[PDB]
Amino acid sequence: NKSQLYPDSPLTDQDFNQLDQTVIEAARRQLVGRRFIELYGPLGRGMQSVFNDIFMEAKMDFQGSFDTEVESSRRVNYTIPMLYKDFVLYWRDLEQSKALDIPIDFSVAANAARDVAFLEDQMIFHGSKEFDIPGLMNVKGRLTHLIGNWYESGNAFQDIVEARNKLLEMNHNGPYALVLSPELYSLLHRVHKDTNVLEIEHVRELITAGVFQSPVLKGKSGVIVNTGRNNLDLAISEDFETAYLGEEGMNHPFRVYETVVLRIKRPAAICTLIDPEE
Amino acid sequence: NKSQLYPDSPLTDQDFNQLDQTVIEAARRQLVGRRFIELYGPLGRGMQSVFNDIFMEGAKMDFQGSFDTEVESSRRVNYTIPMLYKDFVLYWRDLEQSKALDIPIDFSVAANAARDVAFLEDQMIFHGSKEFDIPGLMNVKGRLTHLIGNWYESGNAFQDIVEARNKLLEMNHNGPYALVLSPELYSLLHRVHKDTNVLEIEHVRELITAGVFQSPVLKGKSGVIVNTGRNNLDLAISEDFETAYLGEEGMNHPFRVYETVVLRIKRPAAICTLIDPEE
Amino acid sequence: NKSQLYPDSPLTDQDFNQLDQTVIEAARRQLVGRRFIELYGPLGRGMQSVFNDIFMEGAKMDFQGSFDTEVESSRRVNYTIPMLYKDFVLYWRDLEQSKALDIPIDFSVAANAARDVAFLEDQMIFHGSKEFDIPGLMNVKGRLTHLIGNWYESGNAFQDIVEARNKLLEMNHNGPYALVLSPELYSLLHRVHKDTNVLEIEHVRELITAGVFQSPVLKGKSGVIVNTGRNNLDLAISEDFETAYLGEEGMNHPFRVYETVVLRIKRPAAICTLIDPEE
Amino acid sequence: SLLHRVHKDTNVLEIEHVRELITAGVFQSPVLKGKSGVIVNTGRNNLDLAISE
């Protein structure tokens, strides 16, 4: 397939395959949001916009009635953004490696992969200002809750129970996912008093799903979200891809890119734990 | 193979293959530097110098695109590959008795030479070599130093580690980190921490996530935290451990072991060093 | 054995198999030292003496190497192999009664003798033989002694073990460690470890990583921690446990058992001892 | 939610003993508003449900 899209690229097909594998491998480790969120199928290049319906928040009788009742959907429109990063190579080193029969080195692309992954995660968690795309901690009706000291007495279990209670009352049940800062993640390994087990073991039983930490969150904070389709979804247009720009001088420049957006239908499936001091 | 390469060697290939294993195992048990550093592929015999690039200094989001690219300061430099070696000696009278009585031969000596050559490699990796002007991890520029308080108290170490983590995070090196400490500091972590009833090492390992190691080469109140992965640090090796006959001096048979390695650091800002106060 | 080597014997070939099986089964359980020490291959009866080289406590880098060879010095000593034996006697009237009544015979005395000789072997290994002038583990030059106090109040035992491991690590000896203690110290460790809520023995076992054993040879408060490895220590066995029939006596049949072994300690620095406090 | 607290000096959770006594499981429904509980003996004869379609 390659060497047809880019006839002028000095790199051969096998080298291109190695470059692509190295690029994807670095991102595979770094990506964390996709673990508990589904994904919409690739839509191609035909669409540059998407439509989302937001739901902010019978008939028991005998056979009969001739009418239809529907509820409002609050239709809104979104635009897909683009993220890119680039790197450069040289010619004398490639010639020397070809002469000495030594495999080529592609170390630089790892930095670009890490940087684009760290921006995709931040865009998912906090949103984008220019396109007015809401973030997980910015949606209205997010059902906030307040936390207390976690250093002593093991109040983490009670806080988790109280947080789950509000969702249970609002009738959102099923699998839950909890994401918290590394500082709070560390403290969970303390022993539970009068039981002598680790509180993380007790919390896992209620959570019934993976508990992970992310560097994007800075202060002491956390989020618990009900996990299912028709509550939130991720729509991708183009996956991670690498292109070769026109050569200038004697060197060769490259670039990477991908396009993705997020949609949230039901704002009431999420709960946010806030520190009183924060 | 070896019998053809060395015709006048007294030892046969059956002994030579065993000697190779005895040499390699001692080095494997004694090398700590290679634990968290990647290795460049063996370049070959026909090279003695390498080139290094020092940047010494975020992704873009747009709708239409961009009409320009971005670059950085290469600052290319050149380095040369040194060699290290050590030697041992066998005796002929002992060999004669073993050959006569069918007793197994002994190859204990090679382990000491392997251990000694590994020790010097560790020392060069940590401190650095003056003769060839190759900088080391401890003394390189842009080390992003940090300071520590009294660790005899229970809770100071955790806060000190968190502060260094934040310093690296603001400097935008985010990823797995590896920590190397002196034996004195490593011992102190094995103490009961109050208010949690758990040893401090368990808490520290949750944040480090890549292991903690201790090395005797450091001398008192020192430590280093380095962001792992390639594109920041690398090790270039041309010829690995090897053993060679040396001649027939007197009636005895001498052998030698040799290896060549070098170290490269591309981005200096990754390394952070903790230093003691009132030094 | 096989009834051809020993004619004129009352016991039959099939019963000789039971006798040797009982002897080896009894001998196996009572030996502790052979668990963590390697064994030199049997030499046959050809050799009656051995040689030992005692090192008793550097590499250089050059672009092209040097024209000279340097080797480390050592000291050579000679050792002789002692013999250990014990004997037991059977009776004829019981054998005749067993033949008449078709009742299986008993061989408890062989097991008792095996236990006694096994105890003597461990005594010799731990304390040494003055007559043959062979040193032992407890009394050697350069054993890196340490002083222990208290050991009644919970974590004090853990602290001493940590400090001893630190001293062993300081001399560039990092590896699996083997700890041997007296029965009283073995019993004392079972108490809970203060506020950690877990038993103290588990942490010591995790640190040691090669297991902890107790021996009745040690009398009071005594402990030894040794680095394992082929080069540090070795055991040379001339012949294993064997049974011999001396010959008829005044209507009774006597037997004996014998075995021959010796110990070599190449590097003294590895061993560390926890000497008792003022006594 | 209230049952999740520890059972005094028994050192185990209170919910486990209730589950052992009940032996058929405990469920929660949003239909009940305040403080309400129902305990029923299972069996074919006691109750039945008839579904037309």
Curated annotation (Swiss-Prot), chain D:
Biotech and industrial use: The encapsulin and cargo pair can be overexpressed in E.coli and in human HEK293T cells. In HEK293T in the presence of 0.5 M ferrous ammonium sulfate nanocompartments can be detected and used as cell markers. Can also be targeted to cell membranes by addition of a farnesylation signal to its C-terminus. Coexpression of this nanocompartment with a smaller nanocompartment from M.xanthus (AC Q1D6H4) allows of expression of different sized iron-rich particles. The encapsulin shell proteins do not seem to mix.
UniProt-annotated site: 5-fold pore central residue, residues: 11
Localization terms from the record: Encapsulin nanocompartment
Domain comment in the entry: Formed of E- and discontuous A- and P-loops. A-loops form the main pores while A- and E-loops are the most flexible parts. E- and P-loops of neighboring monomers arrange head-to-tail and form a chainmail topology.
Similarity-based family: Belongs to the encapsulin family. Family 1 subfamily.
Subunit (UniProt): Initially thought to form a 180 subunit shell. Forms hollow shells composed of 240 subunits, making a shell about 42-43 nm in diameter. The monomer is capable of assuming 4 different conformations which allows packaging into the icosahedron. The shell has 12 pentameric and 30 hexameric capsomers which form the vertices and faces of the icosahedral nanocompartment.
Biological role stated in the UniProt entry: Shell component of a type 1 encapsulin nanocompartment. Assembles into proteinaceous icosahedral shells 42-43 nm in diameter with an iron- and phosphorus-rich core (1Fe:1.1P) which can store over 23,000-35,000 iron atoms (with a calculated maximum of 83,000 Fe). There are 2 types of negatively charged open pores in the cryo-electron structure; a 3-fold pore where 3 hexamers meet with a minimal size of 7.2 Angstroms and a 5-fold pore where pentamers meet with a minimal size of 2.3 Angstroms. The 2-fold pore seen in other encapsulin nanocompartments is closed.
Protein name: Type 1 encapsulin shell protein
The species this protein was found in: Bacillus thermotolerans (Quasibacillus thermotolerans)
Phylogenetic classification of the source organism: Bacteria, Bacillati, Bacillota, Bacilli, Bacillales
Entire-sequence positions represented here: 190 to 242 of 282
